[PDB]
Design a protein around this ligand. Structure first.
Ligand SMILES: CC(C)=CCC/C(C)=C/COP(=O)(O)OP(=O)(O)O
Ligand SMILES: [Mg+2]
Length: 302
């Protein structure tokens, strides 16, 4: 439906407008048209994410794609929207769906850069572990090489994975996080073992409220590139930053981002990313939600 396409793109321009970013129509429209059938409201999930620091001038968008549509990456490459990288990341999404049960896909891009990643969601009642994922042929070796470290901190079940074709990286979104996993002492030992920025009192408090945690890995080495803690809430003032700018800019976005489910508050997902020499924050404001998001809010934002 050309209608849903225009609408989704307009909302995307709105979100970008809030951060002073311009959408590259030539890179976005073709992508939205290709999966236009998935833009239907109801069972679709769409997110527009902002970030701080060196990411403050970009705006990401995520769109859920039903598995029935087939490998979303093969589609973008076949249509000529993106050039295969020639690396294992090209087959990872396909191999993941082949070896494990995938409940749904998702495409991700940046308003000025275009397409850059896909996601593979797993059934909540049938989530794979570190061992099941590390056995995927195209999966980065780093996953298996860090298996002992993951198990030591209670990172077992994975609710989904994401593949970044431009940076050739993979994220493992751990779920069912225990309390001792998110304890201050545990989080500190973990970051130190990975050589990432040490979170302060404020950051640690945010890590404790996390419902999801995801490390980023690559095919070059067995070293984790960064680690992210995600919190989901309806509260627009949670950005874990002490900078006046961030507090103001994030809260503004959280209260003005577009959303197609009037009648409820905006679902928000905040992120605290720790890299070797710094930390940055991100915030995704959902444009479209489903009962999954509602279920999560009841469980982690009560
Ligand atoms: C359709 C749905 C429900 C999408 C959810 C996407 C999500 C939780 C992304 C987290 O990664 P990121 O956006 O913070 O960045 P990166 O992958 O680059 O680390
Ligand atoms: Mg992003």
């Amino acid at each position: 439906e050309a209608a849903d396409v225009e609408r989704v793109y307009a909302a995307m321009e709105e979100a970008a407008g809030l951060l002073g970013v311009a959408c590259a129509r030539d890179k976005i429209y073709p992508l939205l048209s290709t999966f236009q059938d998935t833009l239907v409201e109801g069972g679709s999930v769409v997110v527009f994410s902002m970030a701080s620091g060196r990411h403050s001038t970009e705006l990401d968008f995520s769109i859920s794609v039903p598995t029935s549509h087939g490998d979303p990456y093969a589609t973008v490459v076949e249509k000529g929207l993106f050039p295969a990288t020639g690396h294992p990341v090209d087959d990872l999404l396909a191999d993941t769906q082949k070896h494990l049960p995938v409940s749904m896909f998702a495409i991700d891009g940046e308003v000025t850069g275009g397409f850059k990643k896909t996601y593979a969601f797993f059934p909540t009642d049938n989530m794979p572990g570190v061992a099941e994922l590390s056995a995927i042929p195209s999966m980065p070796p780093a996953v298996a090489e860090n298996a002992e470290l993951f198990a030591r901190y209670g990172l077992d079940k994975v609710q989904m994975t994401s593949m970044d074709y431009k940076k050739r990286q993979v994220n493992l979104y751990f779920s069912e996080l225990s309390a001792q996993t998110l304890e201050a002492e545990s989080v500190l030992a973990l970051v130190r073992e990975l050589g990432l920025h040490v979170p302060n009192e404020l950051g640690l408090k945010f890590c404790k409220r996390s419902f999801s945690v995801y490390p980023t890995l690559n095919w070059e080495t067995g070293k984790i590139d960064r680690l992210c803690f995600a919190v989901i809430s309806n509260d627009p003032t949670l950005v874990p930053s002490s900078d006046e700018g961030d507090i103001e800019k994030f809260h503004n976005y959280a209260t003005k981002a577009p959303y197609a489910y009037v009648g409820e508050k905006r679902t928000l997902v905040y992120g605290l990313t720790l890299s070797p020499k710094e930390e940055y924050y991100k915030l995704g404001a959902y444009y479209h939600i489903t009962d999954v998001q509602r279920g999560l809010l009841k469980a982690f934002d009560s």
